[PDB]
Each structure stands twice: as structure tokens, then as C-alpha cells.
Short mmCIF file of C-alpha atoms in Angstrom, two decimals:
data_model
loop_
_atom_site.label_atom_id
_atom_site.label_comp_id
_atom_site.label_asym_id
_atom_site.label_seq_id
_atom_site.Cartn_x
_atom_site.Cartn_y
_atom_site.Cartn_z
CA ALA A 4 9.30 -35.33 -2.02
CA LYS A 5 5.67 -34.51 -1.30
CA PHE A 6 3.25 -33.48 -4.00
CA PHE A 7 2.46 -29.84 -3.23
CA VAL A 8 -0.76 -27.92 -3.86
CA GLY A 9 -1.16 -24.23 -3.11
CA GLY A 10 -4.46 -22.38 -3.31
CA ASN A 11 -4.02 -18.76 -4.33
CA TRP A 12 -7.28 -17.02 -3.46
CA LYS A 13 -6.01 -13.77 -5.06
CA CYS A 14 -7.95 -10.67 -4.13
CA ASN A 15 -11.18 -12.49 -3.29
CA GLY A 16 -13.28 -13.09 -0.25
CA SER A 17 -15.69 -11.55 2.23
CA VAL A 18 -16.13 -12.39 5.89
CA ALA A 19 -19.05 -14.70 5.12
CA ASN A 20 -17.47 -16.27 2.03
CA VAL A 21 -14.16 -16.94 3.76
CA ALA A 22 -16.02 -18.59 6.64
CA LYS A 23 -17.90 -20.77 4.16
CA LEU A 24 -14.74 -21.69 2.20
CA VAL A 25 -12.90 -22.63 5.37
CA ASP A 26 -15.82 -24.89 6.38
CA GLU A 27 -15.77 -26.55 2.97
CA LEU A 28 -12.02 -27.09 3.14
CA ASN A 29 -12.37 -28.58 6.62
CA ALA A 30 -14.98 -31.01 5.25
CA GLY A 31 -12.49 -32.37 2.72
CA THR A 32 -10.15 -35.27 3.08
CA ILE A 33 -6.57 -34.95 1.89
CA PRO A 34 -4.28 -37.98 1.28
CA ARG A 35 -1.33 -38.54 3.54
CA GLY A 36 1.88 -37.23 2.12
CA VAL A 37 0.54 -34.18 0.23
CA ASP A 38 1.48 -30.69 1.31
CA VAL A 39 -1.45 -28.26 0.94
CA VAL A 40 -1.07 -24.50 1.43
CA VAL A 41 -3.89 -21.93 1.29
CA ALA A 42 -3.14 -18.23 0.59
CA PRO A 43 -5.85 -15.76 1.68
CA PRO A 44 -5.69 -11.98 1.35
CA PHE A 45 -3.70 -10.54 4.25
CA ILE A 46 -6.71 -9.39 6.25
CA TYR A 47 -8.14 -12.92 6.52
CA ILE A 48 -4.97 -14.73 7.56
CA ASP A 49 -5.82 -14.45 11.28
CA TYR A 50 -9.30 -15.93 10.86
CA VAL A 51 -8.10 -18.68 8.53
CA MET A 52 -5.22 -19.63 10.77
CA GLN A 53 -7.61 -19.96 13.71
CA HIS A 54 -10.37 -21.89 11.90
CA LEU A 55 -8.75 -24.01 9.15
CA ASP A 56 -7.68 -27.53 10.08
CA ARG A 57 -3.96 -27.56 10.71
CA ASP A 58 -3.68 -31.29 10.10
CA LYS A 59 -4.72 -30.73 6.45
CA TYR A 60 -3.59 -27.19 5.58
CA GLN A 61 -0.83 -24.66 6.09
CA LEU A 62 -1.12 -20.91 5.55
CA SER A 63 0.60 -18.72 2.99
CA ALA A 64 0.59 -15.03 2.20
CA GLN A 65 0.26 -13.82 -1.40
CA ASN A 66 3.18 -11.34 -1.25
CA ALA A 67 5.67 -9.68 1.08
CA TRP A 68 7.92 -6.64 1.03
CA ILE A 69 11.51 -6.81 -0.27
CA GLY A 70 13.04 -6.13 3.16
CA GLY A 71 12.34 -5.88 6.88
CA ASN A 72 10.03 -3.63 8.86
CA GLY A 73 10.11 0.08 8.29
CA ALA A 74 8.63 3.07 6.48
CA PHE A 75 6.82 1.17 3.76
CA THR A 76 3.16 2.20 4.07
CA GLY A 77 0.82 -0.55 2.89
CA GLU A 78 3.37 -3.39 2.91
CA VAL A 79 3.72 -6.50 5.08
CA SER A 80 7.16 -7.92 5.83
CA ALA A 81 8.36 -11.50 5.80
CA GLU A 82 9.46 -10.99 9.43
CA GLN A 83 5.88 -10.09 10.33
CA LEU A 84 4.53 -13.14 8.53
CA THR A 85 6.95 -15.50 10.29
CA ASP A 86 6.17 -13.96 13.67
CA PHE A 87 2.46 -14.33 12.92
CA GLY A 88 2.92 -18.07 12.42
CA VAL A 89 2.56 -18.08 8.60
CA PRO A 90 4.91 -20.70 7.08
CA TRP A 91 4.76 -19.78 3.35
CA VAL A 92 4.66 -16.85 0.95
CA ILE A 93 3.97 -16.63 -2.79
CA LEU A 94 6.46 -14.30 -4.49
CA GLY A 95 6.77 -13.11 -8.07
CA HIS A 96 3.27 -14.09 -9.19
CA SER A 97 2.67 -13.08 -12.78
CA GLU A 98 0.04 -10.54 -11.67
CA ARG A 99 2.70 -8.75 -9.59
CA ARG A 100 5.43 -9.03 -12.25
CA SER A 101 2.96 -7.36 -14.63
CA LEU A 102 0.76 -4.97 -12.62
CA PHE A 103 3.45 -4.01 -10.09
CA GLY A 104 6.48 -4.23 -12.37
CA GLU A 105 8.27 -6.68 -10.07
CA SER A 106 11.50 -7.43 -11.94
CA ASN A 107 13.42 -10.69 -11.98
CA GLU A 108 15.79 -9.05 -9.49
CA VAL A 109 13.08 -7.86 -7.17
CA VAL A 110 11.41 -11.29 -7.10
CA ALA A 111 14.76 -12.97 -6.37
CA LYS A 112 15.61 -10.52 -3.56
CA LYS A 113 12.12 -10.86 -2.06
CA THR A 114 12.71 -14.61 -2.13
CA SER A 115 16.14 -14.53 -0.41
CA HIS A 116 14.82 -12.05 2.16
CA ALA A 117 11.79 -14.22 2.92
CA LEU A 118 13.94 -17.35 3.27
CA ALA A 119 16.27 -15.53 5.64
CA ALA A 120 13.23 -14.45 7.67
CA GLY A 121 12.19 -18.06 8.10
CA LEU A 122 9.46 -18.49 5.40
CA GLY A 123 9.14 -21.08 2.71
CA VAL A 124 8.67 -19.44 -0.70
CA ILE A 125 6.52 -20.40 -3.69
CA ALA A 126 8.67 -18.57 -6.25
CA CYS A 127 6.78 -17.90 -9.48
CA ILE A 128 8.12 -17.63 -13.02
CA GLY A 129 6.60 -17.73 -16.49
CA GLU A 130 6.59 -16.22 -19.96
CA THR A 131 3.87 -14.34 -21.84
CA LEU A 132 2.20 -14.96 -25.19
CA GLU A 133 4.32 -12.20 -26.78
CA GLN A 134 7.48 -13.86 -25.46
CA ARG A 135 6.43 -17.28 -26.72
CA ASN A 136 5.44 -15.74 -30.10
CA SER A 137 8.88 -14.15 -30.46
CA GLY A 138 10.86 -17.30 -29.80
CA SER A 139 11.97 -15.99 -26.39
CA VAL A 140 10.74 -18.77 -24.08
CA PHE A 141 14.26 -19.94 -23.14
CA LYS A 142 15.67 -16.46 -22.87
CA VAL A 143 12.87 -15.33 -20.55
CA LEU A 144 12.75 -18.41 -18.32
CA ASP A 145 16.55 -18.66 -18.10
CA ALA A 146 16.75 -15.02 -17.01
CA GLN A 147 14.00 -15.47 -14.39
CA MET A 148 15.75 -18.52 -13.00
CA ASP A 149 19.26 -17.01 -13.20
CA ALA A 150 18.06 -14.17 -10.97
CA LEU A 151 16.67 -16.65 -8.43
CA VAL A 152 19.82 -18.78 -8.51
CA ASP A 153 21.92 -15.67 -7.86
CA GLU A 154 19.99 -14.93 -4.62
CA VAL A 155 19.04 -18.36 -3.31
CA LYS A 156 21.70 -20.71 -1.95
CA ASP A 157 19.41 -23.23 -0.13
CA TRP A 158 16.38 -24.48 -2.06
CA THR A 159 15.07 -26.75 0.71
CA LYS A 160 12.16 -24.40 1.47
CA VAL A 161 11.58 -23.14 -2.09
CA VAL A 162 8.84 -24.44 -4.39
CA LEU A 163 9.20 -23.30 -8.00
CA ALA A 164 5.86 -22.42 -9.70
CA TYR A 165 5.66 -22.23 -13.48
CA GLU A 166 2.90 -19.99 -14.83
CA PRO A 167 2.21 -20.33 -18.56
CA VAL A 168 1.20 -16.66 -18.80
CA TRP A 169 0.73 -17.18 -22.58
CA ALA A 170 -2.26 -19.40 -21.57
CA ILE A 171 -3.73 -17.14 -18.89
CA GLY A 172 -6.28 -14.64 -20.22
CA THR A 173 -5.23 -14.90 -23.88
CA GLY A 174 -7.76 -17.36 -25.31
CA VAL A 175 -4.99 -20.01 -25.52
CA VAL A 176 -5.12 -23.27 -23.55
CA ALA A 177 -1.96 -25.07 -22.42
CA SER A 178 -2.01 -28.81 -22.87
CA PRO A 179 -0.50 -31.19 -20.32
CA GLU A 180 2.18 -31.94 -22.90
CA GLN A 181 3.07 -28.25 -23.24
CA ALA A 182 3.18 -27.98 -19.43
CA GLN A 183 5.44 -31.00 -19.14
CA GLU A 184 7.75 -29.66 -21.85
CA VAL A 185 8.41 -26.55 -19.75
CA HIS A 186 8.72 -28.47 -16.51
CA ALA A 187 11.29 -30.84 -18.09
CA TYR A 188 13.22 -27.81 -19.34
CA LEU A 189 13.18 -26.26 -15.86
CA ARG A 190 14.27 -29.52 -14.27
CA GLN A 191 17.36 -29.83 -16.48
CA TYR A 192 18.19 -26.16 -15.93
CA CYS A 193 18.05 -26.62 -12.23
CA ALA A 194 20.18 -29.78 -12.43
CA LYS A 195 22.86 -27.83 -14.18
CA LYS A 196 22.70 -24.77 -11.94
CA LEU A 197 22.05 -26.43 -8.58
CA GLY A 198 23.19 -30.01 -8.97
CA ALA A 199 21.20 -33.09 -9.86
CA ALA A 200 20.40 -33.89 -6.22
CA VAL A 201 18.83 -30.50 -5.49
CA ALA A 202 16.98 -30.51 -8.81
CA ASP A 203 15.51 -33.94 -8.19
CA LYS A 204 14.10 -32.93 -4.80
CA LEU A 205 12.85 -29.48 -5.91
CA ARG A 206 9.10 -29.26 -6.32
CA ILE A 207 8.26 -27.68 -9.67
CA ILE A 208 4.52 -26.96 -9.53
CA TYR A 209 2.25 -25.96 -12.38
CA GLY A 210 0.41 -22.66 -12.13
CA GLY A 211 -1.56 -22.60 -15.36
CA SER A 212 -5.27 -23.10 -15.27
CA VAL A 213 -5.74 -25.97 -12.84
CA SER A 214 -9.21 -27.27 -12.13
CA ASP A 215 -10.88 -30.38 -10.81
CA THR A 216 -11.42 -31.31 -14.50
CA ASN A 217 -7.78 -31.29 -15.69
CA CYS A 218 -5.81 -31.97 -12.49
CA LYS A 219 -5.19 -35.70 -13.07
CA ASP A 220 -4.04 -35.20 -16.65
CA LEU A 221 -1.48 -32.71 -15.37
CA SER A 222 -0.46 -34.51 -12.17
CA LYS A 223 0.68 -37.61 -14.06
CA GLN A 224 3.27 -35.64 -16.04
CA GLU A 225 6.80 -36.63 -15.08
CA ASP A 226 8.09 -33.20 -13.98
CA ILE A 227 4.86 -31.71 -12.51
CA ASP A 228 5.10 -31.97 -8.72
CA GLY A 229 1.91 -30.16 -7.79
CA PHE A 230 -0.07 -27.05 -8.51
CA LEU A 231 -0.46 -23.38 -7.75
CA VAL A 232 -4.25 -23.16 -8.15
CA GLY A 233 -6.05 -19.92 -8.99
CA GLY A 234 -9.85 -19.59 -9.17
CA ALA A 235 -10.58 -23.25 -8.39
CA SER A 236 -9.08 -22.61 -4.93
CA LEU A 237 -12.21 -20.57 -4.10
CA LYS A 238 -14.41 -23.69 -4.40
CA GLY A 239 -13.64 -26.00 -1.53
CA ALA A 240 -14.62 -29.40 -2.94
CA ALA A 241 -13.01 -28.66 -6.31
CA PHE A 242 -9.81 -27.58 -4.58
CA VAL A 243 -9.82 -30.70 -2.38
CA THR A 244 -10.17 -32.79 -5.54
CA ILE A 245 -7.05 -31.11 -6.99
CA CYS A 246 -5.23 -32.02 -3.77
CA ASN A 247 -6.32 -35.64 -4.31
CA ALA A 248 -4.75 -35.74 -7.81
CA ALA A 249 -1.39 -36.66 -6.24
CA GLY A 250 -1.83 -40.41 -6.66
CA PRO A 251 1.61 -42.06 -6.42
CA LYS A 252 3.31 -38.70 -5.93
CA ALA A 253 2.02 -38.47 -2.38
CA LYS A 254 4.85 -39.40 0.01
CA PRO A 255 3.03 -40.83 3.06
CA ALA B 4 -15.55 19.81 12.13
CA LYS B 5 -13.64 17.46 14.39
CA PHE B 6 -9.89 17.62 14.78
CA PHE B 7 -8.63 14.39 13.19
CA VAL B 8 -5.57 12.33 14.11
CA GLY B 9 -4.51 9.24 12.20
CA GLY B 10 -1.74 6.91 13.33
CA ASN B 11 0.08 5.32 10.41
CA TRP B 12 2.01 2.39 11.85
CA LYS B 13 3.61 1.72 8.43
CA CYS B 14 5.24 -1.66 8.07
CA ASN B 15 5.86 -2.19 11.78
CA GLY B 16 4.68 -4.53 14.45
CA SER B 17 4.88 -8.06 15.83
CA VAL B 18 2.20 -10.02 17.62
CA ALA B 19 3.61 -9.07 21.01
CA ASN B 20 4.32 -5.43 20.10
CA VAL B 21 0.89 -4.88 18.60
CA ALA B 22 -0.70 -6.33 21.73
CA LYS B 23 1.38 -3.97 23.86
CA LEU B 24 0.59 -0.91 21.69
CA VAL B 25 -3.11 -1.66 21.78
CA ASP B 26 -2.96 -1.89 25.60
CA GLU B 27 -1.16 1.45 25.76
CA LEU B 28 -3.69 3.09 23.46
CA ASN B 29 -6.53 1.70 25.56
CA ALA B 30 -4.92 3.24 28.66
CA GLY B 31 -5.06 6.71 27.10
CA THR B 32 -7.77 9.27 27.38
CA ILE B 33 -8.90 11.16 24.30
CA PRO B 34 -10.92 14.42 24.45
CA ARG B 35 -14.49 14.43 23.27
CA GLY B 36 -14.88 15.66 19.75
CA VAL B 37 -11.59 14.35 18.27
CA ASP B 38 -11.64 11.67 15.61
CA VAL B 39 -8.74 9.20 16.05
CA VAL B 40 -7.93 6.52 13.47
CA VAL B 41 -5.22 3.85 13.80
CA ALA B 42 -3.78 2.11 10.69
CA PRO B 43 -2.06 -1.25 11.33
CA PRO B 44 -0.52 -3.49 8.68
CA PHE B 45 -3.24 -5.59 7.06
CA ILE B 46 -2.49 -8.77 8.99
CA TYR B 47 -3.14 -7.12 12.37
CA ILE B 48 -6.42 -5.40 11.53
CA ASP B 49 -8.50 -8.31 12.91
CA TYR B 50 -6.70 -8.35 16.26
CA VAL B 51 -6.75 -4.56 16.58
CA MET B 52 -10.40 -4.30 15.69
CA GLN B 53 -11.24 -6.87 18.37
CA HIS B 54 -9.03 -5.43 21.15
CA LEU B 55 -8.78 -1.64 20.64
CA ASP B 56 -11.39 0.50 22.39
CA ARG B 57 -14.04 1.49 19.89
CA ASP B 58 -15.15 4.48 21.94
CA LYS B 59 -11.71 6.08 21.40
CA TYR B 60 -10.43 4.70 18.08
CA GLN B 61 -11.48 3.71 14.59
CA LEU B 62 -9.53 1.45 12.24
CA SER B 63 -7.89 2.28 8.93
CA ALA B 64 -5.95 0.32 6.35
CA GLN B 65 -2.72 1.71 4.90
CA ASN B 66 -3.63 1.04 1.23
CA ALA B 67 -6.15 -0.65 -1.04
CA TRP B 68 -6.31 -1.81 -4.64
CA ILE B 69 -7.54 0.47 -7.44
CA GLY B 70 -10.66 -1.63 -8.11
CA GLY B 71 -12.83 -4.46 -6.82
CA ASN B 72 -12.06 -8.10 -6.10
CA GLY B 73 -10.33 -10.18 -8.70
CA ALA B 74 -7.05 -11.55 -10.04
CA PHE B 75 -4.73 -9.20 -8.20
CA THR B 76 -2.43 -11.43 -6.15
CA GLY B 77 -1.22 -9.71 -2.99
CA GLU B 78 -3.78 -6.87 -2.99
CA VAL B 79 -6.71 -6.08 -0.68
CA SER B 80 -9.79 -4.34 -2.04
CA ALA B 81 -11.80 -1.49 -0.60
CA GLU B 82 -14.86 -3.77 -0.79
CA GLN B 83 -13.08 -6.28 1.43
CA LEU B 84 -12.12 -3.58 3.91
CA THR B 85 -15.68 -2.24 4.15
CA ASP B 86 -17.08 -5.75 4.57
CA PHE B 87 -14.50 -6.38 7.29
CA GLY B 88 -15.80 -3.40 9.25
CA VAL B 89 -12.84 -1.05 8.55
CA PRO B 90 -14.10 2.54 8.15
CA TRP B 91 -10.99 4.29 6.71
CA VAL B 92 -8.12 3.84 4.28
CA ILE B 93 -4.94 5.86 3.68
CA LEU B 94 -4.32 6.33 -0.05
CA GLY B 95 -1.49 7.96 -1.95
CA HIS B 96 1.02 8.04 0.91
CA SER B 97 4.33 9.47 -0.22
CA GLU B 98 6.02 6.08 0.31
CA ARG B 99 3.61 4.53 -2.23
CA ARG B 100 3.82 7.45 -4.69
CA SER B 101 7.60 6.95 -4.60
CA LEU B 102 8.34 3.25 -4.05
CA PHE B 103 5.29 1.96 -5.96
CA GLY B 104 5.06 4.70 -8.57
CA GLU B 105 1.45 5.52 -7.70
CA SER B 106 0.63 8.42 -10.01
CA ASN B 107 -1.68 11.33 -9.30
CA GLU B 108 -4.26 9.51 -11.43
CA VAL B 109 -3.89 6.21 -9.65
CA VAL B 110 -4.23 7.84 -6.22
CA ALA B 111 -7.35 9.72 -7.35
CA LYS B 112 -8.96 6.59 -8.83
CA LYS B 113 -8.12 4.56 -5.73
CA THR B 114 -9.81 7.32 -3.74
CA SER B 115 -13.03 7.43 -5.82
CA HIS B 116 -13.18 3.63 -5.82
CA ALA B 117 -12.75 3.46 -2.05
CA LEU B 118 -15.42 6.12 -1.48
CA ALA B 119 -17.82 4.23 -3.73
CA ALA B 120 -17.10 1.08 -1.71
CA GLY B 121 -18.13 2.83 1.47
CA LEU B 122 -14.75 3.85 3.03
CA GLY B 123 -13.58 7.19 4.25
CA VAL B 124 -10.25 8.13 2.65
CA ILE B 125 -7.19 9.90 4.05
CA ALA B 126 -5.93 11.13 0.67
CA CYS B 127 -2.25 12.07 0.78
CA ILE B 128 -0.39 14.67 -1.26
CA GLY B 129 2.96 16.42 -0.99
CA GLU B 130 6.02 17.66 -2.84
CA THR B 131 9.67 16.60 -2.58
CA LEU B 132 12.83 18.56 -1.84
CA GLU B 133 13.75 18.54 -5.54
CA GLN B 134 10.33 19.96 -6.41
CA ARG B 135 10.58 22.67 -3.77
CA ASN B 136 14.17 23.46 -4.91
CA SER B 137 13.00 23.91 -8.51
CA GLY B 138 10.19 26.31 -7.72
CA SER B 139 7.57 23.65 -8.50
CA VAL B 140 5.60 23.55 -5.24
CA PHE B 141 2.42 25.02 -6.77
CA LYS B 142 2.69 23.05 -9.97
CA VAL B 143 3.09 19.77 -8.09
CA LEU B 144 0.41 20.34 -5.44
CA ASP B 145 -2.07 21.77 -7.96
CA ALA B 146 -1.63 18.71 -10.18
CA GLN B 147 -2.06 16.30 -7.24
CA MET B 148 -5.22 18.08 -6.17
CA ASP B 149 -6.58 18.50 -9.72
CA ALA B 150 -6.42 14.72 -10.12
CA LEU B 151 -8.35 14.22 -6.88
CA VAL B 152 -10.94 16.86 -7.78
CA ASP B 153 -11.49 15.15 -11.14
CA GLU B 154 -12.41 11.85 -9.40
CA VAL B 155 -14.06 12.93 -6.17
CA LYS B 156 -17.47 14.61 -6.22
CA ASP B 157 -18.37 14.26 -2.48
CA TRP B 158 -15.67 15.22 0.02
CA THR B 159 -17.73 14.46 3.13
CA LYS B 160 -15.69 11.33 3.90
CA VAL B 161 -12.32 12.58 2.60
CA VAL B 162 -9.54 13.91 4.82
CA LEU B 163 -6.74 15.61 2.90
CA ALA B 164 -3.23 14.89 4.31
CA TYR B 165 -0.32 17.13 3.36
CA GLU B 166 3.10 15.48 3.55
CA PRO B 167 6.07 17.87 3.32
CA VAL B 168 8.19 15.20 1.61
CA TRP B 169 10.99 17.82 1.32
CA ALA B 170 11.21 17.54 5.17
CA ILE B 171 10.98 13.75 5.44
CA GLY B 172 14.36 12.00 5.32
CA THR B 173 16.28 14.93 3.80
CA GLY B 174 17.88 16.55 6.85
CA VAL B 175 15.42 19.48 6.52
CA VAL B 176 12.87 20.35 9.22
CA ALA B 177 9.54 21.98 8.39
CA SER B 178 8.51 24.75 10.74
CA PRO B 179 4.91 25.25 11.83
CA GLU B 180 4.90 28.41 9.73
CA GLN B 181 5.99 26.49 6.63
CA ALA B 182 3.29 23.89 7.34
CA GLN B 183 0.63 26.56 7.74
CA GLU B 184 1.72 28.27 4.52
CA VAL B 185 0.97 25.09 2.57
CA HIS B 186 -2.25 24.39 4.42
CA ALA B 187 -3.49 27.94 3.70
CA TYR B 188 -2.61 27.44 0.03
CA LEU B 189 -4.52 24.14 -0.05
CA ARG B 190 -7.51 25.69 1.68
CA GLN B 191 -7.85 28.47 -0.91
CA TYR B 192 -7.38 25.98 -3.74
CA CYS B 193 -10.12 23.84 -2.39
CA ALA B 194 -12.41 26.87 -1.94
CA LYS B 195 -12.00 27.70 -5.57
CA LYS B 196 -12.38 24.14 -6.87
CA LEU B 197 -15.03 22.84 -4.47
CA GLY B 198 -16.75 25.90 -3.07
CA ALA B 199 -16.08 27.79 0.12
CA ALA B 200 -18.52 25.68 2.15
CA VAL B 201 -16.86 22.36 1.27
CA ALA B 202 -13.39 23.83 1.76
CA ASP B 203 -14.25 25.17 5.19
CA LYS B 204 -15.48 21.79 6.42
CA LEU B 205 -12.67 19.74 4.81
CA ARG B 206 -10.09 18.47 7.26
CA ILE B 207 -6.60 19.27 5.99
CA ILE B 208 -4.24 17.31 8.25
CA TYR B 209 -0.49 17.65 8.51
CA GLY B 210 1.64 14.60 7.76
CA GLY B 211 5.14 15.92 8.31
CA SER B 212 7.07 14.82 11.32
CA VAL B 213 4.53 14.99 14.14
CA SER B 214 5.59 14.12 17.66
CA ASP B 215 4.47 14.72 21.20
CA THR B 216 7.09 17.52 21.25
CA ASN B 217 5.81 19.63 18.31
CA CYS B 218 2.10 18.74 18.16
CA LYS B 219 0.77 21.84 19.97
CA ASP B 220 2.86 24.24 17.92
CA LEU B 221 1.36 22.70 14.78
CA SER B 222 -2.21 22.21 16.03
CA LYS B 223 -2.67 25.92 16.73
CA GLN B 224 -2.04 26.85 13.09
CA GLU B 225 -5.17 28.20 11.44
CA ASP B 226 -5.45 25.67 8.57
CA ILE B 227 -4.06 22.53 10.31
CA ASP B 228 -7.03 20.35 11.27
CA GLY B 229 -5.15 17.36 12.63
CA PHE B 230 -2.31 15.02 11.86
CA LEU B 231 -1.26 11.93 9.97
CA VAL B 232 1.33 10.64 12.45
CA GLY B 233 4.19 8.35 11.43
CA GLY B 234 6.68 6.84 13.91
CA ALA B 235 5.19 8.51 17.00
CA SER B 236 2.06 6.40 16.39
CA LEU B 237 4.05 3.35 17.54
CA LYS B 238 4.41 4.81 21.06
CA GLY B 239 1.03 4.78 22.73
CA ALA B 240 1.36 7.59 25.27
CA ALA B 241 3.12 9.88 22.77
CA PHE B 242 0.39 9.22 20.22
CA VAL B 243 -2.34 9.87 22.80
CA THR B 244 -0.63 13.18 23.60
CA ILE B 245 -0.81 14.16 19.90
CA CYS B 246 -4.53 13.36 19.99
CA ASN B 247 -4.84 15.71 22.98
CA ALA B 248 -3.28 18.63 21.03
CA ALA B 249 -6.73 19.47 19.61
CA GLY B 250 -7.55 22.08 22.24
CA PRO B 251 -10.36 24.30 20.89
CA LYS B 252 -10.46 22.37 17.62
CA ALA B 253 -12.18 19.45 19.31
CA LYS B 254 -15.90 19.57 18.47
CA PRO B 255 -17.56 17.88 21.49
#
């Protein structure tokens, strides 16, 4: 029910800058009834967990391994994250689908593994400019979702994040109307695959370029339940403003 | 000059188990003149850095991104690690060459980037059972090293780790004589590519199965300068014993 805002810091930070960002976030006020998650690089999670106000913010990781602990040098498991006290993980971000070749199948299995390990998952999908140019939007999104549906039985702790990758680094802007068109499409897909009750409660958050300038134009769209924020999450007051875009979608 | 032992914890740990392992490591005594590095999963680096005895142990990460900070969700940069106070990183581990498709070229560029960001690098190489079966040992190792040589000009802060991947998970054991044969081969390669002076000072550490049972048989081999330890690194007293295998190769 709650408007949901996640802040994906990506691969950014230093000890001093993280300390400063945490202080700025702690200075902000968040409306009742909004869920706000902050996702630092792995090395900072300890510090952030210990210094960021728990009344306002929950922690997320930016990725996790496909399975449990073992001989996977460099990786962090969902079991480790849960044991650490982290409640959320972002999985299938466009940067990992592209740079790391995470397939639809890998994202879906990471998601079911993480859920079974006790995390909530911000599961990311989205199509590129080439795919939109070729008339493949439905084919691509349907296949991304079909893979998730195959792995996930309980969507209570899933948040679905749509990334308009065609409008990320291409010189193209996505309008709020274009965003809403996709979110409406995803909503009706999910109603058919999961049932109208599950689809109505599922948070479908927008992960295009979200700033303190455009957040209210996006948050008023019928099927946009929140945001997965990129670079604006690195600026505390701007990020807090995005969290305050909930308006009537906050569920105090 | 110093015998060098790294402990690669891989994707293992919990809050309680890491606390226990750190206590066990702190209970151990290490000879003067041995460098010992411990590599936890990213999320534990903070805790380990703050609780593990600095007189005995330095920290390492198990991986880093190919470049600096930016839009690389899930990744940690070498710049972040240096700023955090971490002195070392493992790059090109066999599990990442295989599971993540890190090419010779990617490992070498990660290495030069990390060195430029101020880290020391444990650069890993090694050939598989298929490659040894096909008579490709030289071709594979030479190509792995040629890629490193192309990127790395200063080897002062590099430690070269040989992983006999043909003897890791295959049902085959590598003898100390087989280990030494490869290390001798690598030494003469490096003398030809880097100069005899650089090759003589370069630590070439063995990253096959290293335990407290076999460590002295390996450490006495002429061209084995230390170890990159896998599962035995999770057992504090066993790992400390491996560190004590240096004998005359400690440089107090």
C-alpha cells in the first residue's frame, strides 16, 4: 500500500561523503506511510546501518549472488545480507543485465533465492532503445516478467521496478505519460498472471531519471507507486524531496 | 622478500562466525617477516578492519570493478577500497574468470586500475584440467601473463597467485613437485618479460589446495613464495599454521 522510494547509490561514495550523505538524510523529514530504502555499496552498509535513522530509512544491498554461501570469490549472499540485518536487495538492475549479462532467468532465480533467504527484493526490468525501436517492448517486458513469475510464488515482499533503459544514457527523455503507459501495461500483465488482488497491492516503482524536479509529475500517475532513484539519491535534500512526492499515496 | 599468505574467505561468513574467526586469528602468533592478508566478503571489511590485530594482519577485498566510481550497480571500486583503508585486492580469481567470464584482458585492466588507485594486487592465473589435458598449459599461462605484463609496468605491489584449476574440484590432487614445476616456469617467464631483478623479488604464491597438512611440503619448494589459501582460511588455527610454514622464507 505504501508509496516506496529506493535510493540506489550505485558505485559511489567515500568515507567522508557517505558520512555527509547520512547526516543530510537524517536531517530530512519523511511523511508517515512512505517506505524509504537506501542502497549503499556493500562496504558502507555497516556504517550506514549504524548511523542512518531507522525510523526514516531501511537498508538495501545493490546485488546478491544467485545462491547460498560458498566458493564464489567476490560475491555476497542473500543469507549473509539477512544475517547482517539488511532487509532489502536490488536485483536485475539494468547495469547488471547489461554489463554482467544477467539473463531474465538469472534475475528471477536471484529473486526467488533472496526471498527464500528472508529479503525483500526490488526486482528490476526494462527495455532498451534498440528494443523500443524494433517494436519489441511487449516481447521484452513480457519475457522479463514471465521469468520472474516462473520463480516467484509470493509477491508480498517484491517491489517491481521499471527502468526505461531507452531513456537512460541515450539522449532520450521519458515523459510521465510514457512512464504511465508502461506501468499500466505492467499492472494488467500482473493482474492476469498473479490475480487482480496481488496486482493491485504490488508496488510498481519507476526507475527512469527521477529527480527533485520531476518527482511530482511522475508520482501522480495512476500506476506509479514510487521510485528507484539513481544519481539524485546522492544528494540528501533532493532525495528527501522525492520521498515527499508521495502525497495521497502515503498510507499513514 | 617476505613470504606472503593470503586468506580468501570467499563467499562465507555470518556476523557471529566472522566475530569468532577474528578472535581465533587474534589468538595466533605469526613469525616476524611474513606478510599475512585476510580477504572477507565486502560487507564484513569494516568489522574486520576494526577488530583484527593490525600488527599481524592486513585486509584485502576479493574483487573490485574495472574502473572508478560511477553507474555500476552492485560493484565496489578500487578507489573506494583505498579510501576505506584496505591495502590489497584479489583480482582474476579462477571463480571469477569462470563464473563471471573475466577475460585475461579484464583481469589485467582491473589490476592496472587497482594499482593506479593505490592498492596492492594479488593477481590470479591458472589453467584448467581441459587445458592441461590438451597440452595447452604454456599457451594458457603465457597468455594470462602476457595480458598482465601489457598493463602492469611496476610490479612492486603485485603478488602473482598460481591456481592449479586442474586440481580444484576435479578429483585430481596437485603434488608439491607439480606446483614447483609451474612456479619455476612462471619465474623464468617473468625474468624474460620483466628482468631478472623484478622476477627475483616477485612473490609467486600457490593457490591450489593449501591446508595445515600440506603447507610445509609446499613452502619448501624453491619458487613458492607463499599461499593464497581457500577453505582453510576459515579455520583460524589452521590458517595461522599455514602462516607459520614460512621457515627461512620469513624476512624478519
